Subunit: 263 residues, 4 copies
């Protein structure tokens, strides 16, 4: 029976039908936004929602028997899995956050549609090279968050009270969000020199972001000229000393013609 | 009189003419902006408008004969068609919003000037390949919109009472416009963890844009290496398939001295 | 024998002296900020400005005499000229707002030095390639100013009442400055769909500013690849043509042992 | 005795120990941020600072011994040194920024981890290039800062009262941080034409930042594209001086078959 289900999971009808259920379920996810619509139709869509989660788990289990292990070595399939698992947690209780994370299920449309995975893939690819810089930055934030909390916390607690208080505030400053009328000018009333802290924080952070981008584009170029030079260097050494194997059978031949002297 | 009017339409004069009207009428739409002006000279401009609109209509008509079905397959003409059609909906009456849409007819200066035509064309060219990602972002927005609305709308209706509402705010946050003192910190007095929503949102949004920009730059400079490489790659073969061919000649010239075979 | 003075205007010391001046006067421009200073040393320093300003006048005259018409085809000169002419107009005058422009004479430091000049010159060079887009965009503003004025100027005259008013505001919205909480959201409390005007506006202008940067970088690299292959090909071709010079005299003296028999 | 110490100092145990010490010390410094923690465990903390501060003074000395004057011509070491100094000075004194500047010793984790000082390097490496542009802009600011102080400082003393205050506001404007509603929009009430100063300032300032990027990127690439030229032209160079070097012997195996006229 294994091959019998495998023909299904792999059909064009399967993926389209699941893509189809993703999409319209998405539309219902959106209609539950309206409190008006939720009245005249609430039980309809929650029903619908239960049908979709059913079909999805059906599907996901099928996919597992058809792919087992390979399935769990697949980033994309793990996603659908966890994102479906979440939806499978009951419409209940105090930790009511999960009712809302059920709208993550719509990200299946990203898994289900190949054009889109490529985009997500292309995006993630940039990340691992950056993990070093991310560390350095987070270190830099940490160190400055500490100083903030200490230098500024007592008189300005909404902003620099806790450690995490200052983290949030320093993120805002980085996005240059209302940074000067909004935070530093207040600070400077008590502590006139605050700028000696915030002006450098701004230049370093902005500096790094910008440059990091420059480096990315330019280093990527550097490897493109690499493969190109290779490809062309590979040519002058494919030719030339293949025109060497022919200018020495001039040589072998030229000296094959050297008992002109015997006569 | 097909050929007689084709001659007029296609002439340099006609085009220079329509352009000149476009400039005057655009100068006068700026003057129509002054309440002070209309009281003194406003009689003059409601007919100037009413006859430039008339002249333009005539033109659009002519041009249609002169190109028939091919006129309605030209982007630039189709524009002129609509942008002048909208200016025909009554001098008053209908709705007064189509009287504001009237001023759009100055974009006919972009349409009727071929430096502008291509400059716009240049700009539009990067879009159709972007389309996929525009969809991915839109889905991202929309999921988050659904999410923000049922997390912050009951308590913060101004910002999150509706999908549309939350679509707006999330756009605001994307442009980083007064996002933290302006939306999130208030949200956070009622909901201390709002940062776990919006900071992830900010990264994704921002990360996608920037990398999108890198990709365009970085991929375009790839294609340029392609055509340069094969330009160069072809030209070594032209001057190195030339070499080994006239050493084949020399190799043979040596085997011309087979005439040692005379003995 | 005017040439005498010509050798002095051109001298290393003529230029180096004027730069000492431009820097000095520039250090006094700053201290004329401290009203603390400008009582205790006001007279002391107003002369310094009077000396400097006459010297520069002299300098400009000499440069003129030396370079004649060719002086007025030189922007760097033309600038020096106007920025000094400006400073000439007395003070009190008709309006203490040309007294302010006087400061602009410090940019003479950009003039007096290369490197500085190269860089200014460097930056400007992208501009002429841009005159077209700058115009399309200006048309784009103009059009949306006219539209914004007449759509919102009635109830929002501070932001959109006058044509120039709408220009200023659309400029602010372009820099995304307090655009939503400070402008559109207020607008929408009277005119709900006003987002249909501002979101597209922001998209258009943002898109244009980014692409233009992308076009500059990539079209730059294309010109850089034109030059590259032509240096590589003009190499490959020429040597490859090096190789056929040693082939024809390894050829037509393989014809003398052939003519041998 | 040198080489015995030298081999300890260069040990990866030495390095890893100091790195470890750097890291746990960083963990305690965030703990000092809590007022709860400092109550219940603050004495545990303040001695560990002493410990680490000693150990590092030891570490720095062992290293000066090992490297002699080579140590003092090393930026990363100079830093490690200068940062340990600050942490040395007795707690309090009259000004207690030093009891805060002490959290800079965490930056040692940068100098200590070889992968981090690499990216700081790459970053720093861009600066020398732009020291001229910097000067240009620093002047430009100065000039505009003088100009605004004496145009808006009497009536707007907070923003423009002194030179210093004008530098701060112009920097605020440069970052485009709340510029219009805030500074510029108020100013224009008193001085209507103030847009004539803050639009130019903004164009110039943002143009120059933005182009400056373009110049790095594109000139970086011009250099990249040239090292490619050499590598390619070098192979060509090689073949056509080095095979005429070894068929110059084939150039004289043809005069031998000539020369055999003689008797
Ligand atoms: C929505 C948005 C931004 C924005 O509107 O902030 C104003 C930027 N700015 C002048 C400026 C920038 C830096 C230091 C000093 C001054 C600007 C904006 C519009 C027109 C002209 C200039 C800024 C930005 C600023 C700060 C933080 C972040 N973040 O974490 O995503 C983004 C950037 P960026 O990479 O910034 C750099 C330039 C050359 C402008 C290109 O884009 C993007 C990608 N996102
Ligand atoms: O007015 P509502 O409550 O029906 O919701 C309006 C939304 O924009 C449509 O879903
Ligand atoms: O305090 P003042 O009056 O001496 O002026 C301070 C300025 O920042 C010095 O140039
Ligand atoms: O009435 P105004 O002030 O908009 O005048 C029109 C000009 O374009 C700007 O002054
Ligand atoms: O305020 P505390 O003492 O509970 O600590 C909160 C900080 O973010 C944790 O160090
Ligand atoms: Ca802002
Ligand atoms: Ca703001």
């Amino acid at each position: 029976m294994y091959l019998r289900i495998t023909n299904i999971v792999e059909s064009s009808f399967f993926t389209k039908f699941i893509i189809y259920l993703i999409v319209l379920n998405g539309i219902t996810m959106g209609l539950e936004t309206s409190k008006t619509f939720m009245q005249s139709f609430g039980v309809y869509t929650t029903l619908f929602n239960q049908i979709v989660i059913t079909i999805f788990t059906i599907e996901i289990i099928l996919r597992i028997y058809v792919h087992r292990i390979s399935f769990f070595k697949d980033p994309w399939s793990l996603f659908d899995f966890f994102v479906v698992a979440i939806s499978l947690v009951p419409t209940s209780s105090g930790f009511e956050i999960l009712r809302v994370l059920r709208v993550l299920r719509l990200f299946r449309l990203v898994t289900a549609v190949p054009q889109m995975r490529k985009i997500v893939s292309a995006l993630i690819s940039v990340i691992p090279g950056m993990l070093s810089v991310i560390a350095l930055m987070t270190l830099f934030f940490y160190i400055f968050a500490i100083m903030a909390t200490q230098l500024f916390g007592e008189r300005f607690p909404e902003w620099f009270g806790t450690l995490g208080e200052s983290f949030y505030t320093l993120f805002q400053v980085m996005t240059l969000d209302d940074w000067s009328n909004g935070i530093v000018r207040p600070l400077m009333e008590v502590y006139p020199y605050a700028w000696v802290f915030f002006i450098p924080f701004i230049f370093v952070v902005t500096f790094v972001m910008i440059n990091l981008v420059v480096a990315i584009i330019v280093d990527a170029m550097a490897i493109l000229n690499q493969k190109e030079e290779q490809h062309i260097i590979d040519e002058v050494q494919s030719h030339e000393d293949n025109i060497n194997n022919e200018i020495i059978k001039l040589r072998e031949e030229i000296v094959e013609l050297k008992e002109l002297i015997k006569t």
